[PDB]
Amino acid sequence: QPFIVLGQEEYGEHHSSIMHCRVDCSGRRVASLDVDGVIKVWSFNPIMQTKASSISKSPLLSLEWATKRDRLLLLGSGVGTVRLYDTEAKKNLCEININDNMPRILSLACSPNGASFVCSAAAPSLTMNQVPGRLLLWDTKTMKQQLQFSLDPEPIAINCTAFNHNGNLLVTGAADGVIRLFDMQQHECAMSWRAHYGEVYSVEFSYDENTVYSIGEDGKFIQWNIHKSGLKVSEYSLPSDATGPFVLSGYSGYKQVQVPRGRLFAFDSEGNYMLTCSATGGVIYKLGLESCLSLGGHRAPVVTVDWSTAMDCGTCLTASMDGKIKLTTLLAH
Numbered sequence: 039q040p041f042i043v044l045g046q047e048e049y050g051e052h053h054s055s056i057m058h059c060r061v062d063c064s065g066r067r068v069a070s071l072d073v074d075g076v077i078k079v080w081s082f083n084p085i086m087q088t089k090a091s092s093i094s095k096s097p098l099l100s101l102e103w104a105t106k107r108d109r110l111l112l113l114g115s116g117v118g119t120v121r122l123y124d125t126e127a128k129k130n131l132c133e134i135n136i137n138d139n140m141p142r143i144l145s146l147a148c149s150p151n152g153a154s155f156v157c158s159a160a161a162p163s164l165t166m167n168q169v170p171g172r173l174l175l176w177d178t179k180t181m182k183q184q185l186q187f188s189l190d191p192e193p194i195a196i197n198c199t200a201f202n203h204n205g206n207l208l209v210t211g212a213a214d215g216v217i218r219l220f221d222m223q224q225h226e227c228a229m230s231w232r233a234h235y236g237e238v239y240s241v242e243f244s245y246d247e248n249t250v251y252s253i254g255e256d257g258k259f260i261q262w263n264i265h266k267s268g269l270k271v272s273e274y275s276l277p278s279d280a281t282g283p284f285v286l287s288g289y290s291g292y293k294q295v296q297v298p299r300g301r302l303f304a305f306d307s308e309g310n311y312m313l314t315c316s317a318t319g320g321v322i323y324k325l326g327l328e329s330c331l332s333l334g335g336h337r338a339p340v341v342t343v344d345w346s347t348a349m350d351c352g353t354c355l356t357a358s359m360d361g362k363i364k365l366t367t368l369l370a371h
C-alpha cells in the first residue's frame with residue numbers, strides 16, 4: 039500500500055455545486071468557488087476554519103493562486119475581467135478589463151517566477167464552444183498586457199493552461215481538442231497537435247517533463263511526448279464519470295448538469311499517482327495504469343479535485359455537486 043489514509047474531513051460551507059477547489063502555494067489554504075459565485079478561503083491543518091468568504095456579483099469562471107506572493111488570488115470572470123484578490127486583507131487590489139468581445143476568462147496561470155500571468159479569454163458560447171479565443175501574457179508588476187500569442191490555425195477557446203516547474207514552457211488545451219505548447223522565452227507556439235476528439239479539459243507536465251498529460255471530452259487520459267512533437271506515449275479510457283457530464287438527479291423530474299470546468303486530475307509530489315473524479319469520490323491510479331484507491335465519501339458526483347503535498351504529507355481535495363468538499367490526508371507509508 040503506497041499511502042496510509044490518516045483521515046477524511048468535510049468542509050460544508052458551500053451550498054451549491056463546486057466549480058473550483060485549489061490549494062495555495064504554501065499548501066496550507068484552499069480557495070474554493072461554487073456555481074453561485076461564492077468564494078471561500080479556508081485552512082484545514084490542524085483544523086478547518088474559514089479565513090474569508092465573499093459572494094461575486096460577477097459570474098466567475100477561473101481561479102489561480104499567485105506563486106511568489108502567497109496570499110494573492112487571481113479570479114477570472116465571465117464579463118472579461120481579472121480580479122487580484124488579497125486573501126489576508128480580504129479586499130481586491132485591482133480589477134483589470136482584459137479584452138473587448140472575449141468575456142469568458144477560461145484560464146489563468148501564474149508564472150513560477152511571479153513576474154507574469156497567462157490569461158485565456160474566449161468569445162461567448164454559441165446560442166457551441168467552437169468559438170474564437172485568445173491567449174494573453176500579462177505583467178504582474180504593472181497588471182498590463184505584455185503580448186497576445188498566435189493561435190494556429192485559427193483563434194479558438196483555450197480551456198486549460200499549466201506551466202512547467204521553471205516557467206519556461208506552457209502547455210494548453212483548447213475546445214477544438216488541440217494541445218499547444220508555448221515556449222515562454224521566445225513567447226511562441228513551439229508545438230501543436232490534435233489531442234482529443236472534443237474539448238481538452240485539463241493538462242499537466244509529467245514530473246520529469248518528458249511528457250505532458252491531458253484529459254478530454256472523449257473520456258481519455260493521454261500522455262504525450264514533448265520531445266517527439268506530441269506523439270502519444272500512452273492512452274487510457276477512464277470511466278465516464280471521470281469526465282462527465284456530471285448529473286445530480288432528484289425524483290422531481292429536476293436535475294443539475296455540470297460540464298468540466300475546474301481541474302479534472304491531480305498528482306502526488308513525485309507524479310507517480312493521479313487523482314480523478316468519480317460519482318462517489320476521488321479515484322487514484324498509479325501511473326505506469328492501474329487503479330490504486332477509491333477514496334469515497336461523497337453522496338453526489340465529484341466534479342473537480344486537487345492534490346497538494348507539503349511536509350511530505352499529501353492532501354487530496356474532492357469536490358461534489360452538492361457543494362461538499364472532502365479532504366483526505368495521505369502519507370506515503
Ligand SMILES: COc1c(C#N)cccc1CC(=O)Nc1ccc2c(c1)CCCN2C(=O)c1ccccc1
Pocket residue numbers: 104105106107108110122131132148151152153178179180181
Ligand atoms: C509578484 O507578485 C504578484 C503576483 C505573484 N506571484 C501575482 C499578481 C500580482 C503580483 C504583484 C502585484 O501585486 N501587482 C500589482 C498590484 C496592484 C496594482 C498593480 C500591480 C498595477 C495596477 C493596479 N495596482 C494598484 O492599484 C496598486 C495597489 C497597491 C500598490 C501599488 C499598485
